[PDB]
Amino acid sequence: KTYVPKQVEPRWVLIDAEGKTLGRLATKIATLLRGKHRPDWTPNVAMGDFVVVVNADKIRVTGKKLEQKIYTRYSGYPGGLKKIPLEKMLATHPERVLEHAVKGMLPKGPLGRRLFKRLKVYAGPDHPHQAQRPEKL
Amino acid sequence: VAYSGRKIWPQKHTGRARHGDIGAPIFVGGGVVFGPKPRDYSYTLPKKVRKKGLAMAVADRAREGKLLLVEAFAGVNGKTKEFLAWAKEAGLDGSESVLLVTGNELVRRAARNLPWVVTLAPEGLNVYDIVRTERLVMDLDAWEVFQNRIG
Amino acid sequence: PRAKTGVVRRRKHKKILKLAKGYWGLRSKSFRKARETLFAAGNYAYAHRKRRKRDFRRLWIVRINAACRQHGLNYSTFIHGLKKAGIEVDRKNLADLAVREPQVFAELVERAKAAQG
Amino acid sequence: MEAKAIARYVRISPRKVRLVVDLIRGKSLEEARNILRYTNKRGAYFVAKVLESAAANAVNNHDMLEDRLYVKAAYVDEGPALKRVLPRARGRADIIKKRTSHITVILGEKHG
Amino acid sequence: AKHPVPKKKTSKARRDARRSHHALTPPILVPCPECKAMKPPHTVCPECGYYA
RNA sequence: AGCGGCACGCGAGCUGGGUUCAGAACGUCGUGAGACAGUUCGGUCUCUAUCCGCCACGGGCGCAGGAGGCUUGAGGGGGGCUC
RNA sequence: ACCGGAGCGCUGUCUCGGCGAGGGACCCGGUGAAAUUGAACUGGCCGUGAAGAUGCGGCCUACCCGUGGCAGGACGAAAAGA
RNA sequence: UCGGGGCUUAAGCCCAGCGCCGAAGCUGCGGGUCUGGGGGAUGACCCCAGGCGGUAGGGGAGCGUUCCCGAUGCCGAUGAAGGCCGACCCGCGAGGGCGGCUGGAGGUAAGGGAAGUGCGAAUGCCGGCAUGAGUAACGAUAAAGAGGGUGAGAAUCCCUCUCGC
RNA sequence: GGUGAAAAGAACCCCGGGAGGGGAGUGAAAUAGAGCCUGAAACCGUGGGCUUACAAGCAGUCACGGCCCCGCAAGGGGUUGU
Ligand SMILES: [Mg+2]
Ligand SMILES: [Mg+2]
Ligand SMILES: [Mg+2]
Ligand SMILES: [Mg+2]
Ligand SMILES: [Mg+2]
Ligand SMILES: [Mg+2]
Ligand SMILES: [Mg+2]
Ligand SMILES: [Mg+2]
Ligand SMILES: [Mg+2]
Ligand SMILES: [Mg+2]
Ligand SMILES: [Mg+2]
Ligand SMILES: [Mg+2]
Ligand SMILES: [Mg+2]
Ligand SMILES: [Mg+2]
Ligand SMILES: [Mg+2]
Ligand SMILES: [Mg+2]
Ligand SMILES: [Mg+2]
Ligand SMILES: [Mg+2]
Ligand SMILES: [Mg+2]
Ligand SMILES: [Mg+2]
Ligand SMILES: [Mg+2]
Ligand SMILES: [Mg+2]
Ligand SMILES: [Mg+2]
Ligand SMILES: [Mg+2]
Ligand SMILES: [Mg+2]
Ligand SMILES: [Mg+2]
Ligand SMILES: [Mg+2]
Ligand SMILES: [Mg+2]
Ligand SMILES: [Mg+2]
Ligand SMILES: [Mg+2]
Ligand SMILES: [Mg+2]
Ligand SMILES: [Mg+2]
Ligand SMILES: [Mg+2]
Ligand SMILES: [Mg+2]
Ligand SMILES: [Mg+2]
Ligand SMILES: [Mg+2]
Ligand SMILES: [Mg+2]
Ligand SMILES: [Mg+2]
Ligand SMILES: [Mg+2]
Ligand SMILES: [Mg+2]
Ligand SMILES: [Mg+2]
Ligand SMILES: [Mg+2]
Ligand SMILES: [Mg+2]
Ligand SMILES: [Mg+2]
Ligand SMILES: [Mg+2]
Ligand SMILES: [Mg+2]
Ligand SMILES: [Mg+2]
Ligand SMILES: [Mg+2]
Ligand SMILES: [Mg+2]
Ligand SMILES: [Mg+2]
Ligand SMILES: [Mg+2]
Ligand SMILES: [Mg+2]
Ligand SMILES: [Mg+2]
Ligand SMILES: [Mg+2]
Ligand SMILES: [Mg+2]
Ligand SMILES: [Mg+2]
Ligand SMILES: [Mg+2]
Ligand SMILES: [Mg+2]
Ligand SMILES: [Mg+2]
Ligand SMILES: [Mg+2]
Ligand SMILES: [Mg+2]
Ligand SMILES: [Mg+2]
Ligand SMILES: [Mg+2]
Ligand SMILES: [Mg+2]
Ligand SMILES: [Mg+2]
Ligand SMILES: [Mg+2]
Ligand SMILES: [Mg+2]
Ligand SMILES: [Mg+2]
Ligand SMILES: [Mg+2]
Ligand SMILES: [Mg+2]
Ligand SMILES: [Mg+2]
Ligand SMILES: [Mg+2]
Ligand SMILES: [Mg+2]
Ligand SMILES: [Mg+2]
Ligand SMILES: [Mg+2]
Ligand SMILES: [Mg+2]
Ligand SMILES: [Mg+2]
Ligand SMILES: [Mg+2]
Ligand SMILES: [Mg+2]
Ligand SMILES: [Mg+2]
Ligand SMILES: [Mg+2]
Ligand SMILES: [Mg+2]
Ligand SMILES: [Mg+2]
Ligand SMILES: [Mg+2]
Ligand SMILES: [Mg+2]
Ligand SMILES: [Mg+2]
Ligand SMILES: [Mg+2]
Ligand SMILES: [Mg+2]
Ligand SMILES: [Mg+2]
Ligand SMILES: [Mg+2]
Ligand SMILES: [Mg+2]
Ligand SMILES: [Mg+2]
Ligand SMILES: [Mg+2]
Ligand SMILES: [Mg+2]
Ligand SMILES: [Mg+2]
Ligand SMILES: [Mg+2]
Ligand SMILES: [Mg+2]
Ligand SMILES: [Mg+2]
Ligand SMILES: [Mg+2]
Ligand SMILES: [Mg+2]
Ligand SMILES: [Mg+2]
Ligand SMILES: [Mg+2]
Ligand SMILES: [Mg+2]
Ligand SMILES: [Mg+2]
Ligand SMILES: [Mg+2]
Ligand SMILES: [Mg+2]
Ligand SMILES: [Mg+2]
Ligand SMILES: [Mg+2]
Ligand SMILES: [Mg+2]
Ligand SMILES: [Mg+2]
Ligand SMILES: [Mg+2]
Ligand SMILES: [Mg+2]
Ligand SMILES: [Mg+2]
Ligand SMILES: [Mg+2]
Ligand SMILES: [Mg+2]
Ligand SMILES: [Mg+2]
Ligand SMILES: [Mg+2]
Ligand SMILES: [Mg+2]
Ligand SMILES: [Mg+2]
Ligand SMILES: [Mg+2]
Ligand SMILES: [Mg+2]
Ligand SMILES: [Mg+2]
Ligand SMILES: [Mg+2]
Ligand SMILES: [Mg+2]
Ligand SMILES: [Mg+2]
Ligand SMILES: [Mg+2]
Ligand SMILES: [Mg+2]
Ligand SMILES: [Mg+2]
Ligand SMILES: [Mg+2]
Ligand SMILES: [Mg+2]
Ligand SMILES: [Mg+2]
Ligand SMILES: [Mg+2]
Ligand SMILES: [Mg+2]
Ligand SMILES: [Mg+2]
Ligand SMILES: [Mg+2]
Ligand SMILES: [Mg+2]
Ligand SMILES: [Mg+2]
Ligand SMILES: [Mg+2]
Ligand SMILES: [Mg+2]
Ligand SMILES: [Mg+2]
Ligand SMILES: [Mg+2]
Ligand SMILES: [Mg+2]
Ligand SMILES: [Mg+2]
Ligand SMILES: [Mg+2]
Ligand SMILES: [Mg+2]
Ligand SMILES: [Mg+2]
Ligand SMILES: [Mg+2]
Ligand SMILES: [Mg+2]
Ligand SMILES: [Mg+2]
Ligand SMILES: [Mg+2]
Ligand SMILES: [Mg+2]
Ligand SMILES: [Mg+2]
Ligand SMILES: [Mg+2]
Ligand SMILES: [Mg+2]
Ligand SMILES: [Mg+2]
Ligand SMILES: [Mg+2]
Ligand SMILES: [Mg+2]
Ligand SMILES: [Mg+2]
Ligand SMILES: [Mg+2]
Ligand SMILES: [Mg+2]
Ligand SMILES: [Mg+2]
Ligand SMILES: [Mg+2]
Ligand SMILES: [Mg+2]
Ligand SMILES: [Mg+2]
Ligand SMILES: [Mg+2]
Ligand SMILES: [Mg+2]
Ligand SMILES: [Mg+2]
Ligand SMILES: [Mg+2]
Ligand SMILES: [Mg+2]
Ligand SMILES: [Mg+2]
Ligand SMILES: [Mg+2]
Ligand SMILES: [Mg+2]
Ligand SMILES: [Mg+2]
Ligand SMILES: [Mg+2]
Ligand SMILES: [Mg+2]
Ligand SMILES: [Mg+2]
Ligand SMILES: [Mg+2]
Ligand SMILES: [Mg+2]
Ligand SMILES: [Mg+2]
Ligand SMILES: [Mg+2]
Ligand SMILES: [Mg+2]
Ligand SMILES: [Mg+2]
Ligand SMILES: [Mg+2]
Ligand SMILES: [Mg+2]
Ligand SMILES: [Mg+2]
Ligand SMILES: [Mg+2]
Ligand SMILES: [Mg+2]
Ligand SMILES: [Mg+2]
Ligand SMILES: [Mg+2]
Ligand SMILES: [Mg+2]
Ligand SMILES: [Mg+2]
Ligand SMILES: [Mg+2]
Ligand SMILES: [Mg+2]
Ligand SMILES: [Mg+2]
Ligand SMILES: [Mg+2]
Ligand SMILES: [Mg+2]
Ligand SMILES: [Mg+2]
Ligand SMILES: [Mg+2]
Ligand SMILES: [Mg+2]
Ligand SMILES: [Mg+2]
Ligand SMILES: [Mg+2]
Ligand SMILES: [Mg+2]
Ligand SMILES: [Mg+2]
Ligand SMILES: [Mg+2]
Ligand SMILES: [Mg+2]
Ligand SMILES: [Mg+2]
Ligand SMILES: [Mg+2]
Ligand SMILES: [Mg+2]
Ligand SMILES: [Mg+2]
Ligand SMILES: [Mg+2]
Ligand SMILES: [Mg+2]
Ligand SMILES: [Mg+2]
Ligand SMILES: [Mg+2]
């Protein structure tokens, strides 16, 4: 009968964002958010590392993107569809662009959100120097 | 069924179901559908078969060794206690069901009230009664009658 | 001879109703609703029974692949090494060794890296 | 121990009186008499009626101390409804249930 | 009957949930100074009277 | 002094002039009963909203000690005319 | 008390709505129905599907329960299409 | 809005290679049933190979309900039928049995016979009870108020005065 | 259509205007109390165990996990978080 892990401790990680290609980084970030790298992986628990990102304001992204490529929010009201280009996202709160990527990469369930909270993204550098600052690339 | 043929309601725009009259079998108290009518359950079994059976019964009963022709009914005159004595001195301890076939009317009366004995006139010989009973005992004269039909 | 319904209907009903204990609302009180639900349930079980295997095969893979990843190679190549090295042993389930008794998993990694080329 | 008292066939809807009963469940006999003493519902009268009887039974039959007993539990049950025909428009007609209640109140000694 | 009608019998759960806010509150009472008895606040009550 | 979509948006929102019931008539066709997309006058439009949606307003709990007051503005709405 | 056209007088028919009165609606006490109802733990968009989806997919959104209101949807109710 | 996120020497397109994932297909292990073929003299039983999605429909084998023979029988107050409950035993299943509780007077083996014999839907029939809902409504907008009395209890009964129709 | 073998049909006391109950008493049984044998289901309610207020649902099913409960015990029952 297959092994079930018990209450273990979350491994807090720290990733430097600047230079990294947006989507490419998000993918790995997501994987870390779930277990999926720890061989005691369990799909219904929440055991992914606490990823911390810094210098997110400096994420690289190929092609025209920034100019083109737009994020759309929808208010409930008529015409309530807002459209905001990648450019202006970074202009203001930029950690958004990475978050909206990692979030869209997490499973959509009630667990998915638990995990989305373990992801801490900052304009960086610097952040809550709690405990582990295990540089990672 | 004793109801009226009247249509119970219009069957249109009433909004109710759709009906003809209370008599209908989907109605409670209505008439039965394929309920039983009185009838003749009898049929005419081939006489030759009726004979064989009567023989095979007597025969089956004879092979078992439970057949017994008699005659010396000293316990004549209808009286149970007397017949009891006769059967006593005859191996009929009332341990086995006896089909007592005989023409003797008084012998009949005697054995009659006994729970383990079925009396019977010779003309009434039938495979059913034969088979019901364990032992078969019959008057010599009656055995002649049985023989007349088949023997 | 008239044969009323009597016990028969009630009894066949109570049976199903037993099977439905625990279901939401009318779905465990109404015989007609109960049966309907059960119909669905039975079919689900039979199909989840088929899936259950297909489910663990997957779980194992990830756990194996996770251990292979930290051990240098990936699952794809790992299996190949093993499949080539004749070590048909490890049924993807028993590759739970990755979780406990890792030195054995490790031993099994080199066997695969050996069979590679 | 505990003392029961039931008034059956009270000509009033259960759902209605039930509102009053739930108001005094667990309460002490003292605050209870008061809660009904000044509750603004028809159910009060009936629930009070059975509550006071429960008390009498408690003491005159079980040596319980009046000034020491509470509402260990109480509940109201539905009795056979009185169905009546209400003439309606366009000749349509329908039945209206003048429902009915079975009010039970069971008292009990405080502590020991 | 005419025009709007309920599309479905409301469940046991839905009904009672609606009746969430049905529970009535107990009366508010205070002991009057005159007797040890209880009275609704700001109200004269029989079996006591008033100080003029 | 824009055109179009939304069951040529909208009758559990209204109207009911038009069309398309039973009355009547003109023309008209039919021996006829009747008929026509040819016309003409008359002609009953249903008090109660369960769910979703929507406009408003509360109760419950939540916001890692409890409380009084003052606030930040993520997110959303309104407004945008012209001589 | 027939159908068409016009004019005078007069007007909340209207521009264009406002205020007020009473009877209801609303709150409390008493009594207490109905049509309807597969079961319900019943959201939006874009698709999809017997071609008009709360129930399929993807995405977005959404603490739990009600009260007064509106009537777009549940191809709403009613009548086995006239 | 490419299913989404997201992707640019690609996560796009083309050419070549190696490996992996993966369906109820195929393999392994156990079980069932049918058919064919083998020993079993043998009824039993074992061995081997193969078949077993299914609507209309055809065929086969069973389960349960009422009644009859078996009944001048047998079971039954040391508790019949029926009811409620079970995580137990048997059966592929329809069911059968056991145990506990209720019930209080009948029940009917083996083996056979005969049918008013099995219900979820017929806007089915009868009865009970739900939902809408503490909702609409309380039946002419001629109109009420107060004191006193009666009474377990009074806006609603009696009396007096005042008001209105 | 049905109390019970028998009316032995509940004296008397207590709360209550009464109804209806609580004692007592009868009976083998009153969970046989009078529309009373057995008393199924829908339906209504009281108590208790598990559970639920960031969550999108034919209401189940598969897995794991927690709490509660039966065999101290390897097991099983209830519940439902993901
Ligand atoms: Mg990866
Ligand atoms: Mg995004
Ligand atoms: Mg997941
Ligand atoms: Mg999904
Ligand atoms: Mg979501
Ligand atoms: Mg007649
Ligand atoms: Mg007739
Ligand atoms: Mg007649
Ligand atoms: Mg007829
Ligand atoms: Mg006729
Ligand atoms: Mg006719
Ligand atoms: Mg009639
Ligand atoms: Mg018709
Ligand atoms: Mg209808
Ligand atoms: Mg019909
Ligand atoms: Mg009919
Ligand atoms: Mg009728
Ligand atoms: Mg009849
Ligand atoms: Mg009759
Ligand atoms: Mg025949
Ligand atoms: Mg002949
Ligand atoms: Mg004589
Ligand atoms: Mg004599
Ligand atoms: Mg004699
Ligand atoms: Mg005799
Ligand atoms: Mg005789
Ligand atoms: Mg005899
Ligand atoms: Mg004779
Ligand atoms: Mg005879
Ligand atoms: Mg039947
Ligand atoms: Mg329920
Ligand atoms: Mg139920
Ligand atoms: Mg596999
Ligand atoms: Mg009464
Ligand atoms: Mg309570
Ligand atoms: Mg009373
Ligand atoms: Mg008393
Ligand atoms: Mg006592
Ligand atoms: Mg209650
Ligand atoms: Mg009733
Ligand atoms: Mg009326
Ligand atoms: Mg009417
Ligand atoms: Mg009606
Ligand atoms: Mg009603
Ligand atoms: Mg409830
Ligand atoms: Mg409840
Ligand atoms: Mg113009
Ligand atoms: Mg124009
Ligand atoms: Mg237009
Ligand atoms: Mg337009
Ligand atoms: Mg169109
Ligand atoms: Mg068009
Ligand atoms: Mg058109
Ligand atoms: Mg147009
Ligand atoms: Mg047109
Ligand atoms: Mg319109
Ligand atoms: Mg209209
Ligand atoms: Mg119109
Ligand atoms: Mg309409
Ligand atoms: Mg006109
Ligand atoms: Mg027209
Ligand atoms: Mg029309
Ligand atoms: Mg006309
Ligand atoms: Mg012509
Ligand atoms: Mg002609
Ligand atoms: Mg013409
Ligand atoms: Mg023409
Ligand atoms: Mg024309
Ligand atoms: Mg003209
Ligand atoms: Mg004309
Ligand atoms: Mg007119
Ligand atoms: Mg007209
Ligand atoms: Mg008119
Ligand atoms: Mg008109
Ligand atoms: Mg009119
Ligand atoms: Mg109408
Ligand atoms: Mg009205
Ligand atoms: Mg509502
Ligand atoms: Mg809805
Ligand atoms: Mg609603
Ligand atoms: Mg809404
Ligand atoms: Mg709110
Ligand atoms: Mg609030
Ligand atoms: Mg504060
Ligand atoms: Mg201040
Ligand atoms: Mg202030
Ligand atoms: Mg702002
Ligand atoms: Mg403004
Ligand atoms: Mg704006
Ligand atoms: Mg005229
Ligand atoms: Mg004129
Ligand atoms: Mg004129
Ligand atoms: Mg003039
Ligand atoms: Mg003039
Ligand atoms: Mg004028
Ligand atoms: Mg204005
Ligand atoms: Mg005025
Ligand atoms: Mg007003
Ligand atoms: Mg008001
Ligand atoms: Mg009211
Ligand atoms: Mg939920
Ligand atoms: Mg909900
Ligand atoms: Mg589009
Ligand atoms: Mg589809
Ligand atoms: Mg369309
Ligand atoms: Mg659509
Ligand atoms: Mg699907
Ligand atoms: Mg959807
Ligand atoms: Mg949405
Ligand atoms: Mg409110
Ligand atoms: Mg209200
Ligand atoms: Mg509302
Ligand atoms: Mg609407
Ligand atoms: Mg893609
Ligand atoms: Mg993604
Ligand atoms: Mg890219
Ligand atoms: Mg080429
Ligand atoms: Mg080439
Ligand atoms: Mg080649
Ligand atoms: Mg090739
Ligand atoms: Mg290959
Ligand atoms: Mg493979
Ligand atoms: Mg696949
Ligand atoms: Mg398979
Ligand atoms: Mg297989
Ligand atoms: Mg096999
Ligand atoms: Mg086999
Ligand atoms: Mg089979
Ligand atoms: Mg075959
Ligand atoms: Mg064979
Ligand atoms: Mg062979
Ligand atoms: Mg052979
Ligand atoms: Mg053999
Ligand atoms: Mg041999
Ligand atoms: Mg042979
Ligand atoms: Mg086979
Ligand atoms: Mg198939
Ligand atoms: Mg049979
Ligand atoms: Mg039957
Ligand atoms: Mg019978
Ligand atoms: Mg007997
Ligand atoms: Mg006898
Ligand atoms: Mg026995
Ligand atoms: Mg006894
Ligand atoms: Mg027994
Ligand atoms: Mg017993
Ligand atoms: Mg029994
Ligand atoms: Mg029961
Ligand atoms: Mg056991
Ligand atoms: Mg056993
Ligand atoms: Mg079998
Ligand atoms: Mg078999
Ligand atoms: Mg069974
Ligand atoms: Mg059984
Ligand atoms: Mg059983
Ligand atoms: Mg007993
Ligand atoms: Mg029998
Ligand atoms: Mg047999
Ligand atoms: Mg038999
Ligand atoms: Mg048979
Ligand atoms: Mg038989
Ligand atoms: Mg047989
Ligand atoms: Mg037979
Ligand atoms: Mg029949
Ligand atoms: Mg049926
Ligand atoms: Mg009846
Ligand atoms: Mg009845
Ligand atoms: Mg009736
Ligand atoms: Mg009915
Ligand atoms: Mg019901
Ligand atoms: Mg009702
Ligand atoms: Mg009703
Ligand atoms: Mg109700
Ligand atoms: Mg009310
Ligand atoms: Mg009202
Ligand atoms: Mg009234
Ligand atoms: Mg009225
Ligand atoms: Mg007065
Ligand atoms: Mg006086
Ligand atoms: Mg007075
Ligand atoms: Mg009194
Ligand atoms: Mg009274
Ligand atoms: Mg007065
Ligand atoms: Mg009055
Ligand atoms: Mg008698
Ligand atoms: Mg009497
Ligand atoms: Mg008494
Ligand atoms: Mg006493
Ligand atoms: Mg007294
Ligand atoms: Mg009274
Ligand atoms: Mg009394
Ligand atoms: Mg005592
Ligand atoms: Mg007693
Ligand atoms: Mg009992
Ligand atoms: Mg008991
Ligand atoms: Mg009597
Ligand atoms: Mg009576
Ligand atoms: Mg009664
Ligand atoms: Mg009961
Ligand atoms: Mg009862
Ligand atoms: Mg019951
Ligand atoms: Mg219940
Ligand atoms: Mg309960
Ligand atoms: Mg409960
Ligand atoms: Mg417990
Ligand atoms: Mg949120
Ligand atoms: Mg489904
Ligand atoms: Mg488990
Ligand atoms: Mg567990
Ligand atoms: Mg613990
Ligand atoms: Mg414990
Ligand atoms: Mg369990
Ligand atoms: Mg679940």
Q: Are D38 and E24 a contacting pair at CB < 8 A?
A: no
- A82/D32 Cα distance (integer angstroms): 61
Q: How far is CA E51 from CA B85, E29, E30, E33, E34, in A?
A: 117, 19, 17, 10, 9
CB contact at 8 A, B115 and B77: no
- D34/D30 Cα distance (integer angstroms): 7
With an 8 Å CB cutoff and a minimum of 3 pairs, decide whether chains D and E touch: yes
* Termini Cα distance of chain A: 36
Q: Would you state the torsion angle of the CA atoms of residues B39, B45, B50, B56, taken in this order, to the nearest 10 degrees?
A: -100
- E43/E50 Cα distance (integer angstroms): 10
CB contact at 8 A, C90 and A69: no
Secondary element (H or E) of residue B50:
helix B47-63
Q: How was this structure determined?
A: X-ray
E29 to chain D: which residues are within 8 Å by CB? 34, 38
- Which nucleotides of strand I lie within 7 A of protein CB? 13-16, 18-23, 40-47, 54-56, 58-65, 78-82
| E14 Cβ within 7 A of any nucleic strand G atom | yes
For chain C residues 1-30, those near strand G by a CB cutoff of 7 A are 24-27, 30
Give the strands of the sheet with A120-121, arranged side by side. Answer: A120-121, A51-54, A13-16, A135-136
User: In Å, how far is C25's CA from the nearest CA of chain E?
Assistant: 8
Q: Are A39 and C60 a contacting pair at CB < 8 A?
A: no
Spatial CA neighbour of D104 closest among D59, D60, D46: D46
Which residues share a beta bridge with D73?
D106
Q: What are phi and psi of C101, to 5 degrees?
A: 70, 55
CB contact at 8 A, A60 and A24: no
- Which nucleotides of strand F lie within 7 A of protein CB? 12, 46-51, 54, 58-59, 75-78
């079996």: which residue's tokens? Answer: E47
């009659």: which residue's tokens? Answer: B112
Q: Are A40 and C59 a contacting pair at CB < 8 A?
A: no
3-state secondary structure (DSSP) of residue D7: strand
Strand B98-101 versus strand B117-120 pairing type? parallel
Spatial CA neighbour of A96 closest among A119, A121, A72, A118: A121
CB contact at 8 A, A83 and A72: yes
């801490």: which residue's tokens? Answer: A120
3-state secondary structure (DSSP) of residue A55: coil
Give burial (CB, 10 Å; 0-12/13-18/19+) of C101.
exposed
CA angle (D65, D71, D75) in 5-degree steps: 140
3-state secondary structure (DSSP) of residue C25: helix
* Number of Cβ within a 10 Å radius of residue D16: 15
E11 to chain C: which residues are within 8 Å by CB? 25-26
For chain A residues 82-121, those near strand F by a CB cutoff of 7 A are 82
DSSP letter for E10, please: P
Q: Helices B140-149 and B47-63, interaxial angle, to 10°?
A: 140
Give burial (CB, 10 Å; 0-12/13-18/19+) of D87.
exposed
DSSP letter for D37, please: H
What type of residue is C28? S
CB contact at 8 A, E29 and E38: yes
Q: Would you state the torsion angle of the CA atoms of residues B45, B46, B52, B57, taken in this order, to the nearest 10 degrees?
A: 0
The answer for residues whose C-beta is within 8 angstroms of residue D18's C-beta and 6 or more apart is: D43, D76
Q: What are phi and psi of E27, to 5 degrees?
A: -60, 155
Task: Report yes or no: E29 at the D interface, CB cutoff 8 Å.
Answer: yes
| B14 Cβ within 7 A of any nucleic strand G atom | yes
CB contact at 8 A, C78 and C112: yes
Q: How far is CA B51 from CA A88, B4, B66, B125, D47, in A?
A: 114, 55, 21, 10, 87
Q: What are phi and psi of A74, to 5 degrees?
A: -125, 110
Which sign, positive or negative, has the C-alpha torsion E43, E45, E48, E49?
positive
Residue C71 token pair = 């051990």
Secondary element (H or E) of residue D30:
helix D29-37
3-state secondary structure (DSSP) of residue B98: strand
Strand A81-85 versus strand A70-74 pairing type? antiparallel
Contact map slice: C 27-86 vs A, CB within 8 A: 56, 59-60, 62-64, 66-67, 69-70
Strand E38-39 versus strand E30-31 pairing type? antiparallel
Rounded distance in angstroms from the CA atom of residue B18 to the C1' atom of nucleotide H57 = 33
- C28/D94 Cα distance (integer angstroms): 32
Residue D77 token pair = 């049950």
| Pick from D20, D23, D38: CB nearest E29 | D38
Chain breaks in chain A (C to N over 2.5 A) after: none
- C90/C101 Cα distance (integer angstroms): 13
- B103/C33 Cα distance (integer angstroms): 72
